Ligand SMILES: CCCCCCCCCCCCCCCC(=O)O
């Protein structure tokens with residue numbers, strides 16, 4: 063019912079391949095590929111504040127689902143997109159050629175980002191605090 | 192008397208002044224000044240693994256107290272220095288013209304970085320898992 067929490071990355075697939083596909087330099091990719099950090103979500107109804115840690119970067123995005131917002135991506139580009147909430151537990155959007163699904167089941171968020179033939183999947187676990 | 196844990200940044204003083212002094216790009220200073228993320232320490236005796244979130248960056252460093260190590264700073268520069276343990280609860284190091292003190296007080300960690308007339312102070316709180 064609520065996405066709010068601090069989430070410890072547990073495992074991911076295709077980090078290097080995804081970051082390569084979107085144009086990040088290999089030297090940066092190798093520096094961040096094995097970090098497993100903590101991302102935070104604060105949900106208040108349709109409103110979300112994301113503090114995402116991915117690789118060597120921290121990105122802070124804010125959006126209300128259903129409203130167009132400017133979201134910073136891993137390339138530094140700020141993309142205009144709308145994130146929708148399907149049910150109470152799935153956040154979906156598309157930007158550039160990437161389909162993103164953020165799904166909360168119990169305490170586990172599965173984030174699946176699909177770019178052509180690359181499925182970049184992150185599994186994180188809510189720190190029960 | 193263990194530093195180990197995950198710590199959420201609670202407050203900080205003089206981020207912008209310190210980051211300017213070390214020459215961080217202004218765009219990174221403005222993006223990162225309000226981010227309050229989670230850093231992690233793993234301590235094994237004198238050996239420490241740090242996953243530090245500072246501004247928009249994640250930095251992973253690894254060293255042993257009393258032995259010279261190579262550490263990545265906030266600018267990405269590599270520096271060679273020795274980290275000492277002071278008074279059994281403070282990690283202290285001096286690299287270039289910076290003195291860093293990382294002090295443990297129960298669930299609170301205070302990182303104080305002094306550069307000339309600038310004292311960059313971070314106060315973080317242990318996440319109870
Ligand atoms: C426009 C969206 C921002 C894209 C930033 C890409 C970095 C990976 C995105 C995954 C974060 C989704 C939240 C779940 C927690 C996590 O996996 O860290």
Ligand SMILES: CCCCCCCCCCCCCCCC(=O)O
Nearest residue numbers: 230243245262263264265302313315
């Ligand atoms: C080797 C020098 C450290 C790298 C430079 C990072 C600048 C900020 C350092 C924060 C100290 C991290 C340790 C305690 C946790 C925290 O305060 O987040």
